[PDB]
Design a binder for this molecule. Sequence first.
Ligand SMILES: [Mg+2]
Ligand SMILES: [Zn+2]
Ligand SMILES: [Zn+2]
Ligand SMILES: [Zn+2]
Length: 1190
Amino acid sequence: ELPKEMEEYFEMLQREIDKAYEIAKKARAQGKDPSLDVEIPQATDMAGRVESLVGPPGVAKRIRELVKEYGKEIAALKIVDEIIEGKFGDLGSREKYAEQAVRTALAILTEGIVSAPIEGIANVKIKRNTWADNSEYLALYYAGPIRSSGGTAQALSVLVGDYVRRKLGLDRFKPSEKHIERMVEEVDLYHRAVTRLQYHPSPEEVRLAMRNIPIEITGEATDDVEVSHRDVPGVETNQLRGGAILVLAEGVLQKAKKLVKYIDKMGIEGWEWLKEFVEAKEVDMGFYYSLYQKFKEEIAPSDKYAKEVIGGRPLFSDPSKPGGFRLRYGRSRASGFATWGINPATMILVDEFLAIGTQLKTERPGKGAVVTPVTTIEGPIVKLKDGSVLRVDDYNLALKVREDVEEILYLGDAVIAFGDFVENNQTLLPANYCEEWWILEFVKALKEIYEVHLEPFTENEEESIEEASDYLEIDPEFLKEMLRDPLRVKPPVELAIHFSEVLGIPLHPYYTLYWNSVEPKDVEKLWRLLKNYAEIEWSNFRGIKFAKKIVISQEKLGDSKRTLELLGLPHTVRDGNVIVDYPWAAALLTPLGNLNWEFMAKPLYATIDIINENNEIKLRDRGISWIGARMGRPEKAKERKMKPPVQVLFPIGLAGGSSRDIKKAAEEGKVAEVEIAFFKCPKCGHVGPEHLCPNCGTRKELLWVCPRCNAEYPESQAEGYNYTCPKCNVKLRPYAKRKIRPSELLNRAMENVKVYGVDKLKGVMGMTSGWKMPEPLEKGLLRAKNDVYVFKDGTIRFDATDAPITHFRPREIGVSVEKLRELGYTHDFEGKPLVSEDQIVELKPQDIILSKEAGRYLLKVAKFVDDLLEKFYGLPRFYNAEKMEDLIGHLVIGLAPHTSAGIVGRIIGFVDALVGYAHPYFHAAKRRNCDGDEDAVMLLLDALLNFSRYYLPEKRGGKMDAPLVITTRLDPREVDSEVHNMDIVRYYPLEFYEATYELKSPKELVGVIERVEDRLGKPEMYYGLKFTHDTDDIALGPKMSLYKQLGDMEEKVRRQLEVAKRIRAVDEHGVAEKILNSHLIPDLRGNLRSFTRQEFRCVKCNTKFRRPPLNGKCPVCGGKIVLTVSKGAIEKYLGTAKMLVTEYNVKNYTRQRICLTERDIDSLFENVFPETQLTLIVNPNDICQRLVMA
DNA sequence: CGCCGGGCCGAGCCGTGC
DNA sequence: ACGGCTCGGCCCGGCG
Ligand SMILES: [Mg+2]
Ligand SMILES: [Zn+2]
Ligand SMILES: [Zn+2]
Ligand SMILES: [Zn+2]
């Protein structure tokens, strides 16, 4: 099957996993933990995950056989049929069968990763249609966690419910009119009062969906809002049901296309209404003039991304505005999943608001992306303070030049993958001319004329190179270098002109200016001025003349300097003269034929059209497609802490104080009463919250207590009683309210682990599980000593933004070649042996690259683990690391904030950014998209030792973010569907570029460009992926966003406004103000409204009063009453709002709203805070009184 | 020997027509 | 849309 390398890779991964698991088992066998074994099983494929998560036992082989024979959907259907009939045992009532079938089928369709089956589906019940016919139907109860499962999981849940109800011989739901009205008002209310819904269904759509769904979509209450249509039959609540209405809105409705596709593939009938809903929902001119008109007609600008701007977050471009982001088709080494490629120069020159990993809301392909440094694409063109125009394609040049920048003429490039267009089904935009298109035209012309075969981006035969060099009269070494790396090696301008003359191809894109950004009449005036009042120095090369310098006076140039700047032409101004130097003089004069032919403006023509019609050297439109973007959600590489930081899962109650400090309570002699689980030693009879008896070191047993009665029964005796009190008729509980003395426990712990000098030790106010089993205090002491925190399930986690990578260089990650050869890497991505640090190596599917903050924190985590192994269990240490570079070769676990299964990865290097680099398969296996998402990482051994299922909260949602199972191998066939559209080609073919001009759809050329989906099944899924664009460094550029270094809101707004003013294609002056004023006005008006209807609270307690007490003091205290909405929380943004109103031109509506808001704020407090203080001077240049007096 | 004042910590809160 | 913004109390250093 697999070759002799990937199998060995997986074998070594399994070997390391076994090495860790043996130590974890040996440590756990001693009985100092809630269980006597590890509580994280390891799986290998989807069937094992499904069996471990939902069951039933023995289903793995059946799932494997059915998916092998028919396919995923048909296998799920056969599994449903087999469960219903009774292959997998006897469950009981039909409700059990229905619930099990729904859960298992949803797990199979969902690949058993996200916890929608586990926690989304609260319960399954059979109800009766009493009001209509007294029939029997099925209802699905949706909890809170289903609200974060995605659109696809909910629609498939409805489909599975329908299939199971049809297979169980049950009738359909027949709602009354009151049900419909209740659902419409609920949909209307939730959007108004809770959340934007990310989608707004029309009322008629809601009526149609309610009338044509054979099951009842219901649930419990999740919002504290009352409804109007009350006491509806069959509905047991009078409040908003967020789970069901979100399922209806974002499930069968928003994802109707995928649902009908699944219906077609699945052989399911009875859903014709959804299909119908989907079907209903679904002269003499120039070449470029027509192209522009057609492009504007078919593809229209999208404004949905820039509808809102938050203060401090800049807007970088207007929709489809020239001068914004230049669209380039390709995929870099560390981009392609959903991320963009950006030059570091345009990161530096926008005031460092953009850092590696900073998210931005995009317009054309999708909505949202993450930026990654690419050093082969072009950077911004800027205008300096003295008048010079410069091209900043470098990072150091930008750092040197930043302080002199007056205006940013052009913003730069953005590399967007073809798979991003395929996934979102976005019509192809016309392609800007670039070096990769030029090299293909070059080789094609060479073959057509001289019959010589050459290919770019590879190595060619010496005979062909010699023949081509002889025919072109060039140096063979130069030809080899330029064919090997067209994106970095460019010919001189004279050589490019010679190539265009001989072969007959357009000019090299590097020497083409933005000729279509100006009008033909402006070029006419500029041509006249150049002919009349200019002096030019000419040259010669192979019989070809080219300009070497242009000198024209400023007074003679006039207002054509703006035309020069709009072409992106670099020049300089000295003592009244504007000078154009050597490389950029022929870039301006050669297209105009060296002034040999007159330039004249013509209607229905463009500048490039006239140039091509008259000149002999041909040109292509260098910039025609532009993109809009807006900043949002800066990158993150921080560790995870609870809302109050916690270091041990031990309840303290109120003895610890406001910070729940256990040590402070222990040192003050306080006694505390809390609910915990007490364990009792069978031999001597010790009692307390400890798993081991200190006197004899023999494992105790949990005590079960009656709720009303107060009899304690050990576990062995309670087993016989069926966990019910014999003298009573009430079920037992493992916990009760008891009193504890922290002094003895903390002294015993300190003596146990020999850790005495710890100042603070924070716990919890109370436990959330149903067991209320506490944690040993020794672990808390060791965590406090090493400065690490804990999570809800007993693990230490680190959150970071995720970015993709497929190929790497040993110098970027700081690892020697010998170390890599020890890890297993022996070749580079071209088959050559690995002997250098500048060679490009291909990443294995489960190898990850950490940041340096992550390494710094994992050093402390490893030290804590070693201390735990040496002091608590008495076993040899494992990591033995003194620096972060010593963690290389060790394993981690990657977990997503919405799933319940993890995946094993390996550490191979570190970077100096704030992102998490890994393979696209690694991010897809966690159901992540990599366009702003964040995930957690933890060391494998720490999770193995520390995780427990008895610390998980008992409510719905306590099983999300839990490593209930971990995958030990990667299979691209069952990771995701968005990663199946990614490109694996070295370069795009000429046909793609020729078809972009026809505005085709990406589906028409799926077979032309190879994707991931074209390799599934064959052994070469992990073997030969490739990339299009190259980058010098993977972590070059700014590392932290400026937004995190600004304190005041006024400072944030001012900096964002200077940024918007610098960029030519933003138009801040009014647009950014009006859009920004819809972020401060909501705050002002909402705070003003909530002030007059607010609740008061005691400082000593947390009890809240809906009405202020008449005495002014807490009735059950002496403490004083404080507000929940202060007066200063209303007028905190009024100064910035007034500044925004006065310094810019907004519509009169917003100005009057601001003035009236200030007047209302003044008038509301008339009798409470009268104006009793005068002032020396009046009229502080305020605008409200000026408007009133006008 | 008795204050003044900082610097942490922990609470709460963020458009809406009858 | 949610981290950013107001309050209140509680020790800990100087400092005279
Ligand atoms: Mg996403
Ligand atoms: Zn004992
Ligand atoms: Zn009892
Ligand atoms: Zn009180």
